[PDB]
């Protein structure tokens, strides 16, 4: 649901997410991590996720992240920078 930024979250939120005590969640997060359904990177500084591979069963809403919220908008930015490479070296392109 959250890629980076909000993906990182406090242990207490995971404690609420696992419906378990925050002290218990230090033990509980490890059990949830153990299932390892999705391979990722997890930091226990705040139990923040910021992990790697994940498989969503389906995308939320109308894939709003897939629109200019994340994708497409970044792609528009790249072509302008590609034009900057052309402007930087038009003669070299020949």
């Amino acid at each position: 649901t959250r890629p980076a930024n909000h993906r990182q979250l406090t242990f207490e939120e995971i404690a609420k997410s696992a419906k378990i005590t925050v002290n218990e969640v230090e033990l509980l997060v490890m059990k949830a991590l153990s299932v390892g359904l999705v391979k990722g990177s997890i930091d226990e500084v705040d139990k923040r996720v910021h992990m790697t591979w994940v498989q969503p069963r389906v995308l939320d809403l109308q894939q709003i992240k897939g629109m200019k919220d994340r994708l497409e908008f970044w792609c528009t930015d790249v072509k302008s920078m590609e034009m900057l490479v052309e402007h930087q070296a038009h003669d070299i392109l020949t």
């Binding site: 230090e26 490890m30 991590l33 153990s34 390892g36 997890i42 930091d43 226990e44 500084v45 992990m51």
Partner: peptide, 16 residues
């Protein structure tokens, strides 16, 4: 092994 980073060593000894 695993992908976890700050899991406690004392807790790991208890897990061991």
């Amino acid at each position: 092994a695993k992908y976890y980073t700050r899991i406690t060593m004392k807790r790991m000894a208890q897990l061991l």
